[PDB]
Amino acid sequence: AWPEEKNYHQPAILNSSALRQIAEGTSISEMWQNDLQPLLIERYPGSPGSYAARQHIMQRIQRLQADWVLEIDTFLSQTPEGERSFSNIISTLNPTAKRHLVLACHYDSKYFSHWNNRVFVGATDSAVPCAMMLELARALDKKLLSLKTVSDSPDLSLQLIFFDGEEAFLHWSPQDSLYGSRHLAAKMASTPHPPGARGTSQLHGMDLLVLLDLIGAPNPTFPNFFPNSARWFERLQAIEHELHELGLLKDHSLEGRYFQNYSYGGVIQDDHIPFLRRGVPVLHLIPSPFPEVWHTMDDNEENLDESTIDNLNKILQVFVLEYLHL
Ligand SMILES: COc1ccc(NC(=S)NCCCn2ccnc2)cc1OC
Numbered sequence: 632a633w634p635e636e637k638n639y640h641q642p643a644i645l646n647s648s649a650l651r652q653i654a655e656g657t658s659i660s661e662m663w664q665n666d667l668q669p670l671l672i673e674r675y676p677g678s679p680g681s682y683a684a685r686q687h688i689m690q691r692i693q694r695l696q697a698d699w700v701l702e703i704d705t706f707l708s709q710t711p712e713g714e715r716s717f718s719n720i721i722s723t724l725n726p727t728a729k730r731h732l733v734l735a736c737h738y739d740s741k742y743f744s745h746w747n748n749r750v751f752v753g754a755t756d757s758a759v760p761c762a763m764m765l766e767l768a769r770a771l772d773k774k775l776l777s778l779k780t781v782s783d784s785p786d787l788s789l790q791l792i793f794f795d796g797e798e799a800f801l802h803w804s805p806q807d808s809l810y811g812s813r814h815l816a817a818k819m820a821s822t823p824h825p826p827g828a829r830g831t832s833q834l835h836g837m838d839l840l841v842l843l844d845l846i847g848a849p850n851p852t853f854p855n856f857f858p859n860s861a862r863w864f865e866r867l868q869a870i871e872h873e874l875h876e877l878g879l880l881k882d883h884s885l886e887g888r889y890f891q892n893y894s895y896g897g898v899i900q901d902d903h904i905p906f907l908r909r910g911v912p913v914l915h916l917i918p919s920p921f922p923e924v925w926h927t928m929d930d931n932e933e934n935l936d937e938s939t940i941d942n943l944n945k946i947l948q949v950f951v952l953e954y955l956h957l
């Protein structure tokens with residue numbers, strides 16, 4: 632019955648003083664300089680930047696005190712440009728814990744031939760989501776380090792996934808997109824979890840996949856996409872509302888709130904799809920509408936909004952602590 636524990640799992644909700652501490656514990660300027668700026672480079676698969684992006688994400692995780700276990704899931708696949716190597720980065724606390732909350736984004740940038748003297752760096756898409764995950768790891772390090780301590784009083788921890796090869800090379804289709812995610816979901820589906828078990832796979836182990844994409848533009852609006860994760864999306868609305876009311880958000884009004892009551896009339900393709908189709912519950916933190924700059928050379932650092940990202944960092948960090956009971 633352990634694979635059903637996720638259906639009954641409740642948050643341990645932070646009080647006001649805890650919320651203030653979380654809000655004070657994250658640094659948007661430190662993220663900007665140390666986590667975000669190095670990723671703002673061309674990083675399509677096999678490019679020098681793909682290698683540098685990968686190294687940057689690993690080193691940043693390595694310096695932290697929490698007991699993160701890193702693994703590079705490297706594979707080859709045919710593409711419209713010929714065979715390419717892809718590498719998902721998986722960073723895991725407590726890898727033998729039966730359950731994990733999983734946060735994810737893609738670290739590859741879409742390939743574009745250079746227009747004027749300009750290159751596409753996918754600032755919202757998804758360098759900012761990567762940086763937010765790294766800042767989350769750093770900001771919560773002391774709290775996460777406590778998961779190293781084994782206790783009677785759930786068998787639940789945290790995993791981060793930075794997918795390679797989310798983007799189409801040429802034209803989005805089932806076969807030219809989601810190379811990293813289709814590979815990893817397939818592997819996890821085939822892999823026993825916990826080790827030695829019968830029946831259960833690493834996908835049963837995924838409580839919830841929180842997939843960040845297209846984050847960093849001002850005034851984003853996120854639909855509540857899926858009934859099976861609606862209660863968790865509702866927690867994000869309430870965290871946002873509470874942080875607002877306590878004066879812990881910046882340049883944020885109730886009218887301009889991010890997390891919306893409405894859903895979306897269509898299906899958005901992204902890295903969650905190969906997990907969702909195999910039954911994993913997904914919280915897809917991608918906005919509708921997409922950033923105005925989407926898939927334009929304008930998806931760049933100048934067009935990011937610092938306050939928005941700092942606000943969303945606070946809300947995500949609170950969510951994660953509440954989910955993990957920390
Ligand atoms: C410009 O607005 C949109 C364009 C297309 C879609 N539909 C789909 S299926 N998009 C999949 C995007 C995959 N991806 C994510 C990041 N980089 C690429 C929805 C849009 O606004 C709701």
Ligand SMILES: [Cl-]
Pocket residue numbers: 919920921
């Ligand atoms: Cl739209």
Ligand SMILES: [Zn+2]
Pocket residue numbers: 741756798926
């Ligand atoms: Zn994209």
